[PDB]
Amino acid sequence: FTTEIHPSCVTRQKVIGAGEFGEVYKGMLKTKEVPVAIKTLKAGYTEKQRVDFLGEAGIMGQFSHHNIIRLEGVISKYKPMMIITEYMENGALDKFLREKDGEFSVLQLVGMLRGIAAGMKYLANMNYVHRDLAARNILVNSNLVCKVSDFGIPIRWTAPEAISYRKFTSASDVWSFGIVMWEVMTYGERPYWELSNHEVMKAINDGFRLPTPMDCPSAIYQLMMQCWQQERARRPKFADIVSILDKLIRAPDSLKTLADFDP
Numbered sequence: 336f337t338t339e340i341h342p343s344c345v346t347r348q349k350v351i352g353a354g355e356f357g358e359v360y361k362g363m364l365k366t367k368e369v370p371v372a373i374k375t376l377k378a379g380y381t382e383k384q385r386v387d388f389l390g391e392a393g394i395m396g397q398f399s400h401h402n403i404i405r406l407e408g409v410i411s412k413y414k415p416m417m418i419i420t421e422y423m424e425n426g427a428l429d430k431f432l433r434e435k436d437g438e439f440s441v442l443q444l445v446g447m448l449r450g451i452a453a454g455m456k457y458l459a460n461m462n463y464v465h466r467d468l469a470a471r472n473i474l475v476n477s478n479l480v481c482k483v484s485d486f487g488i489p490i491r492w493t494a495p496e497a498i499s500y501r502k503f504t505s506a507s508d509v510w511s512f513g514i515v516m517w518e519v520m521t522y523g524e525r526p527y528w529e530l531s532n533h534e535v536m537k538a539i540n541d542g543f544r545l546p547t548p549m550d551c552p553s554a555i556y557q558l559m560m561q562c563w564q565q566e567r568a569r570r571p572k573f574a575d576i577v578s579i580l581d582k583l584i585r586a587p588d589s590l591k592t593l594a595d596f597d598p
């Protein structure tokens with residue numbers, strides 16, 4: 336099932352974006368009132384668009400994890416149709432970190448990566464391949480919890496066997512996670528900067544990998560490199576990534592850089 340919500344229990348308060356299917360709002364939901372994100376289906380939709388739009392909520396409704404965006408419910412009996420999710424105060428991860436450049440501890444950044452990895456582990460253990468994992472598709476709440484969203488072709492986030500041979504697996508999601516680690520540790524820099532998609536694919540085949548971010552711990556960058564192994568069977572699983580990041584968090588000197596020992 337999917338909880339069906341009566342439109343009188345929703346208040347749209349502010350437009351916060353333009354989605355694939357229509358406008359997206361911040362609002363409130365009566366259940367004590369809770370802040371929500373509200374995706375609407377624009378009037379004048381094709382049957383395919385209506386099916387696609389409501390399919391997102393079908394997938395999302397199958398999952399319940401602290402690092403996966405919560406579906407509160409849908410409005411499908413009234414118009415416009417709406418998908419109601421938990422509101423995430425700090426928005427998209429890549430934009431959040433760019434606005435906060437240099438303002439987090441390395442422990443805090445690794446903790447965000449730990450949450451993302453835990454959400455992805457849950458997805459993989461439910462045999463869900465995401466295929467579109469990127470910092471723009473992760474949301475951050477006011478307590479800095481990061482949650483995967485976007486349940487429904489960007490070359491530089493995709494594993495080469497998925498580009499060349501359309502082999503999308505949890506292992507290719509792991510490649511994407513590596514790129515996400517690099518987005519996080521650079522505070523939202525664009526992967527491969529403005530190299531062309533062709534130059535990106537060419538460099539990866541020749542063995543180029545993204546370079547170490549400034550002040551990135553050695554174990555974190557080497558974990559990225561392991562996620563970017565050309566042969567997908569040599570990549571860590573998400574269960575391994577979660578276990579590795581927990582060890583680093585528990586030995587936090589492993590995360591320190593020079594400024595932690597000087598000005």
Ligand SMILES: COc1cc(Nc2ncc3c(n2)-c2ccc(Cl)cc2C(c2c(F)cccc2OC)=NC3)ccc1C(=O)O
Binds near residue numbers: 354420471484
């Ligand atoms: C977009 O900007 C924000 C969104 C915020 N919150 C928020 N919370 C939930 C959602 C969204 N946005 C949002 C806003 C606009 C758009 Cl177009 C989409 C969404 C999404 C969303 C996403 F960010 C990525 C992928 C899929 C999404 O919907 C499923 N999911 C729901 C908060 C702050 C900001 C900000 O920049 O200050």
